[PDB]
Design a protein around this ligand. Structure first.
Ligand code: HEM
Length: 121
């Protein structure tokens, strides 16, 4: 495997403004190439709140996610999202539940990479 950091901002549906979702992911993320496949690797903070997350490209194709690491003590989760070189955006659909505070919501957002996913040597 090889990798590079990549900056990103999650933005609110229909807007270029920062989404609250951006505040619950670590930055920067990473691009990884392994076995000729590309992934965006990112860390979800307060992972227990993220009851469902789905990623899509701009064409609305599904992007497979896998769990790389679950840090239960820190409540973080590292995931890989399948991507291709040239991707600039991802659409996300998330179900966020924090029961203590009566928070159970479904959102759409768009994750904007600083620069398009690169080809890696
Ligand atoms: C994993 C944790 C959380 C995630 C991923 C998340 C994500 C989001 C998203 C995607 C929206 C829709 C508008 C946008 O994209 O910004 C939103 C709205 C909102 N959520 Fe959350 N949220 C989280 C935790 C919280 C917490 C802890 C609170 C505490 C009350 C909260 C209260 C709110 C409020 C007040 C809004 C609308 C306010 C505004 O538009 O600025 N959420 N959130």
């Amino acid at each position: 495997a090889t990798s590079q950091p990549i900056n990103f901002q999650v933005q609110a549906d229909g807007s270029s403004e920062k989404s609250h979702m951006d505040d619950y992911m670590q930055h920067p993320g990473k691009v990884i190439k392994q076995n000729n496949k590309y992934y965006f690797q990112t860390v979800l903070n307060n992972a227990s709140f993220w009851k469902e997350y789905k990623f899509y490209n701009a064409n609305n194709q599904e992007l497979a996610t896998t769990v790389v690491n679950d840090n239960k003590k820190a409540d973080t989760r590292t995931i890989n999202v399948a991507v291709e070189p040239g991707y600039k955006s991802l659409t996300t659909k998330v179900h966020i539940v924090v029961p203590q505070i009566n928070y159970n919501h479904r959102y759409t957002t768009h994750l904007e990479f600083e620069k398009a996913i690169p080809t890696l040597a």
